[PDB]
Amino acid sequence: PKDSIDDYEKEYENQLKEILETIIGVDDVSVVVNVDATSLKVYEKNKSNKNTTTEETDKEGGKRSVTDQSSEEEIVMIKNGDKETPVVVQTKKPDIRGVLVVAQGVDNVQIKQTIIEAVTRVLDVPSHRVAVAPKKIKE
Amino acid sequence: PKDSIDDYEKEYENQLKEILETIIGVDDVSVVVNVDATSLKVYEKNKSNKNTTTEETDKEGGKRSVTDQSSEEEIVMIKNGDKETPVVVQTKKPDIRGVLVVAQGVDNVQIKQTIIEAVTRVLDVPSHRVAVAPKKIKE
Amino acid sequence: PKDSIDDYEKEYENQLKEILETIIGVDDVSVVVNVDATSLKVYEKNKSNKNTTTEETDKEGGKRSVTDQSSEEEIVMIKNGDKETPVVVQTKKPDIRGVLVVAQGVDNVQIKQTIIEAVTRVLDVPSHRVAVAPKKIKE
Amino acid sequence: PKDSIDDYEKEYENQLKEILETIIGVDDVSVVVNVDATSLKVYEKNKSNKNTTTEETDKEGGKRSVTDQSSEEEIVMIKNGDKETPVVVQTKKPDIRGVLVVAQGVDNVQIKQTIIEAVTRVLDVPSHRVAVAPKKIKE
Amino acid sequence: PKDSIDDYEKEYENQLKEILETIIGVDDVSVVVNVDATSLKVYEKNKSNKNTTTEETDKEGGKRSVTDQSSEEEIVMIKNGDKETPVVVQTKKPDIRGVLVVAQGVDNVQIKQTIIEAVTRVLDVPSHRVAVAPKKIKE
Amino acid sequence: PKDSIDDYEKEYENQLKEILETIIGVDDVSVVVNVDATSLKVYEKNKSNKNTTTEETDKEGGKRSVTDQSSEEEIVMIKNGDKETPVVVQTKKPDIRGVLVVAQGVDNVQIKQTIIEAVTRVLDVPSHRVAVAPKKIKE
Structure with missing residues (x-):
């Protein structure tokens, strides 16, 4: 049920964290x-497929x-006895939706674009489903 | 289930690491x-295949x-008894999505392009699914 | 499962190593x-095959x-009893994807091209799936 | 499984070795x-074959x-009892892919071409699947 | 399996040897x-064959x-009881692929052509599958 | 299996030997x-055969x-009981492929042609499958 979900998220949540501190930063x-999911x-x-197409001009x-x-x-x-x-x-892993907070960010465009292209390309997450926010706590 | 996954990633994660320290660097x-996956x-x-195509001009x-x-x-x-x-x-291995951090990087184009062509060609990973980030920790 | 894989790779990994030290180098x-795989x-x-083709001009x-x-x-x-x-x-061996590190390399075109043509022609690996990197550790 | 492979390769690997020292060299x-494989x-x-072809001009x-x-x-x-x-x-032997190292080589065209025509014609290996490298260790 | 092969080759390998020392040489x-193989x-x-062909001009x-x-x-x-x-x-013998080394050879065209025509015509081996090399060890 | 072969060859190999010393020589x-084979x-x-052919001109x-x-x-x-x-x-004897060495030979055309026509006509061996070589050991 859900439980095998909660593990996944945190397994993500921690990686980006420990990693993203390691850029400029x-x-x-x-x-x-x-x-x-x-x-x-x-x-x-088992499968069957039929493609019949035609085209005409004269x-x-x-x-x-x-x-x-x-x-x-x-x-x-499969069959075993009655079974x-x-x-x-x-088996596949699920898709994703996520955002972020960081001590520095979208106010500096070059730490803005760096991240998006880093996050999306890891998780196969298009831009419109990912978003970010300036500051964190202390400045 | 997942478990046979987690092994794979790390088995990758460690190789590139130990190897990529060994370029210029x-x-x-x-x-x-x-x-x-x-x-x-x-x-x-078992299989059956039928391709019937024709073409006409006059x-x-x-x-x-x-x-x-x-x-x-x-x-x-197979059949054994009732079974x-x-x-x-x-058996095949799965595809991949990945990125990186490095003490030096995309700011120097020739250590930029070196890597991409090195990573993609190892894993069969097109560019848009792989990405990189400048610095690491110490500079 | 995987295990019969891991043996193969290393069996490769060691050969090229011990061998490629033996060029110029x-x-x-x-x-x-x-x-x-x-x-x-x-x-x-068992098999059946039918090729019926025709062509006309006048x-x-x-x-x-x-x-x-x-x-x-x-x-x-086969049949034995119920079985x-x-x-x-x-039985066949799998295809390949691979790269390399070397104490000298693509900076010298003639140690560059030497290798590619040596690696690809051993493993049946087209160029775009194989790649190389300059230096190793010590220079 | 694989095992009957590993024997074959070495059985090859040793012959060419002991032999190729015996040219010029x-x-x-x-x-x-x-x-x-x-x-x-x-x-x-058992087999059945039907070739019906025709051609017309007028x-x-x-x-x-x-x-x-x-x-x-x-x-x-075959049938024995239930079996x-x-x-x-x-039974046939498999095809081949191979290369080489030698204390002297492709730098001298006449020890270059000598070998190719010697190797390919032994193993039924076209050129593009076989390749060679100059030097070995000591010069 | 293979074993009945290994005997054949050597049975060949020794004959040509002991014999070819006996030319000029x-x-x-x-x-x-x-x-x-x-x-x-x-x-x-059992067999059945039908050849129906026709041709027309007017x-x-x-x-x-x-x-x-x-x-x-x-x-x-055959049938015996249930069997x-x-x-x-x-029963037939297999085809062949082979080459050679000799203390003298293709550098002298008349000891070159002598051999080819001698080897091919023994084994039913076309030229392109047989090849030779100059010297042996001592000169 | 093979064994009934090896006898045949030698039975040939010895005859020509003992005989061919007895020409000129x-x-x-x-x-x-x-x-x-x-x-x-x-x-x-049992057999059935039908040849129906026709031809027309007008x-x-x-x-x-x-x-x-x-x-x-x-x-x-045959049938015996269940058997x-x-x-x-x-029963027939197999075809042949062979060559020769002799203390004198093709250098003298009239001891050259003598042999070919002698060997081929014994064994039903066309020329291109039989070949000969000059000298033997001592001259």
Whole structure:
């Protein structure tokens, strides 16, 4: 349930902290993060796929587009005695939403842009979902 | 579950560290990395494939494209007594997302570009998913 | 699982090391490598293949291409009593991703190009997946 | 598994060594090699093959190509009691990827070309998969 | 498995040696050879073959080629009680890849060409798969 | 297996030796030979054969060739109780590949051509698969 979430966030929350003190800096920070899910399963599937498309033009005009796409999927199930169980392929980690506090920041554009490009590119988080705030406590 | 992840990251985190101190340098570093998954299974499959395509032109015009693609896949299953189990072909390692800290860096373009081309080409990580930061602690 | 991986990498990591000290040189090195998989199975299959293609032109024009390709594959299964098991043909080694450190290097183009052509041609690794770095520790 | 590989490589690695000291020379060498597989099985198969092709031209023009190729294959299976087992025809050795070090070498074109044509023609290894390096240790 | 290979090579390696010292000479030699397989089985088969082809020309033109080729093959199986076993017709020896060292050689064209035509015609080995090297040890 | 081969070769190797000393001569020799197989079985078969061909020409032109060839073969099997076994018609000896050494030879064209025509016509060996070398040991 949730519990395997709470671990993840802090595991993030601490890294950026200990790391981001290590830029110019940027002498201290405090952060928060929001995970959108728990860990994602994946299960194997049999599959069928059909793509039938055509296009036509001619002397007068034949302009036509017919694009057919049909896909069936079916899960796979192990069997032991009476038991029947799905297959486990792999497991993924969830996406992210997060922001920050820092003893110095967006007031200095070059410590502003440094961070955004550092945070987004770590977590695969677009800009509009990440944000930052000037100061922290002491100045 | 996650656990087989945490090992991977550190196994990465330490290598680049111990190695990247060994360039010009670039006298020290600290890093973080994000794995997108756990280890990936692969399972064997029976298969069927049909590609029927044609093209036409003529005196006036015959311009037509008909591209048919049909693919079925089915997994294979071992049998022992009542038991039924899938086949294991091979196993893959996950993709990556990562950044860095270093006692010297992007302020010097030639220690900037050196690294990117070194990191990406190791891990199969495009540039936009990797990023770096100037200084570390002491200067 | 992973374990049969870790052996492979080091088995590589040590060879290039002990060997590459033996060029001009190039008096010392340190390396890292990334394997993309574990050992690959292959399993035997019954097969069916149909290639029906035609082409036409004529006085006015007959220009037509009809290319039909249909392929079915089915795995083979041994039988003992109730048991049913696949056939093992052969086994392959995985592909590679790797880089390097050396006491001398890309600053001297002729020790630069020497290596690339030496590394790629050993491992079947295209250039863009392999990279190198100047110095090592002591100069 | 791998083990039957490791033997092969060394069995190669030692031969070229002991032999290549015996040219002009070329007074010493050190080498490495990469096998792409383990030993390859072959299994017998029943077969069916159909090749139906035609071609036409005429006074105006009949230009047409219809090339039909249909092939079915099926494996053969021995039977003993309940047991069912495949047939073993023969066994093949794997392909190769390799390079070299030598106390003298590509700097002298005539000890350069001598080797390539000697190595490739032994192992059935095209040039682009084989490469060499000047010196070894002592000069 | 491999073992029946290793015998073959040496059985070759020694003959050419002891023999090739016996030309002009050419006072000494050392060699290596690569076998591509183990011994090849052959198994009997029932068979069916159909070749239907036609051709046409006429006053204007009848130019047409219709070439039909259909072949089925099926293996034969002995029967004893429950047992079922294939037939053994004959057995073949494998092809070859090899080269050489000699106390004198390709520098003298007439001891060059003598050998090639001697080696290839023994083993059924085309030239491009066989190669030679000047000197041996002592000169 | 192989063993019935090794006997054959020597049985050849000795004859030509003891015999070829007995020409002009040509005072001594040493030889080698390669057999391509072991002894060949033959098994009886029921059979069916159909050859339907026609041809046409006429006033304008009827030029047509229709050549139909259909052949089925089936093996014969003895029966005793449950047992079933094939028929043995006869047995053949394998083809050959061989060369030679002699105390005198191709330098004298008339002891050159004498031999070729003598060797080939014994063994049914075309020229390109047989070859010879001048001298032997002592001159």
